[PDB]
Design a protein around this ligand. Structure first.
Ligand SMILES: [Mg+2]
Ligand SMILES: [Mg+2]
Ligand SMILES: [Mg+2]
Ligand SMILES: [Mg+2]
Ligand SMILES: [Mg+2]
Ligand SMILES: [Mn+2]
Length: 234
């Protein structure tokens, strides 16, 4: 029979507008993550977060170890960037594809880099966004689609590396053999037609999928960095 992860792929794209690629991604064993940095030192924030995350998970690869690794990533970024004259930080969305004996697949997320499940041709967002617009979705006041065009969607309500304390969301991922998971920065949904995003995201070869996802975002104007991690489950 089949492994729980069949294959995975990643892509990151600065796009034609931004002066830096302040996104970062990670694909290492059963650990997958995206971090979208912001601010003058946002690239430092996201890269440092993932380096720390990776090391902490490797030292303790279970649910509690993952959550401690996220705390350590927060602390390390805040120690390095907290004395700057303006605020820089990062989002973080991490997936660990644990076996059932370790509680099954888990997502830990802070900010607005979503996790999606792709099943039977449908793409749905599993995480809530910690942004002004995302909170209105969490309040049942606007839809995810409306949140996409909300004029305050760019304003985060939770972020890593901006203070000594963080409260990420933590939850199991309802998924199984045949599903595809996608972690993305918000650049993917900045502008493009949702149908074309789903077309790209359902490409059979995950290496093709990640390339096509970046291209869809770019073709639509590439106003932000776009980073995607695709994981095919067995
Ligand atoms: Mg960014
Ligand atoms: Mg639909
Ligand atoms: Mg956003
Ligand atoms: Mg953003
Ligand atoms: Mg955006
Ligand atoms: Mn972004």
């Amino acid at each position: 029979g089949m492994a729980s992860v069949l294959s995975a792929a990643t892509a990151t794209d600065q796009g034609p507008v931004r002066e830096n690629n302040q996104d970062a991604c990670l694909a290492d064993g059963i650990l997958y993550a995206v971090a979208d940095g912001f601010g003058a030192r946002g690239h430092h924030a996201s890269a440092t977060a993932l380096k720390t995350l990776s090391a902490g998970f490797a030292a303790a690869p279970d649910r509690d170890g993952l959550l401690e690794a996220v705390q350590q990533a927060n602390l390390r970024v805040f120690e390095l960037l907290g004395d700057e004259p303006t605020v820089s930080g990062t989002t973080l969305t991490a997936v660990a594809v644990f076996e059932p004996g370790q509680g099954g697949p888990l997502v830990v997320n802070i900010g607005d880099s979503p996790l999606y499940r792709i099943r039977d041709g449908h793409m749905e967002q599993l995480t809530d966004d910690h942004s002004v617009a995302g909170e209105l979705v969490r309040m049942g006041e606007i839809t995810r689609h409306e949140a996409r065009w909300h004029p305050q969607r760019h304003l985060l309500t939770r972020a890593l590396g901006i203070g000594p304390h963080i409260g990420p969301d933590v939850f199991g991922i309802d998924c199984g053999p045949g599903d595809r998971l996608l972690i993305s920065s918000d650049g993917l949904f900045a502008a493009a037609d949702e149908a074309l995003i789903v077309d790209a995201a359902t490409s059979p070869d995950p290496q093709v999928a990640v390339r096509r996802l970046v291209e869809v975002a770019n073709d639509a104007g590439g106003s932000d960095n776009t980073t995607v991690v695709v994981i095919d489950l067995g």
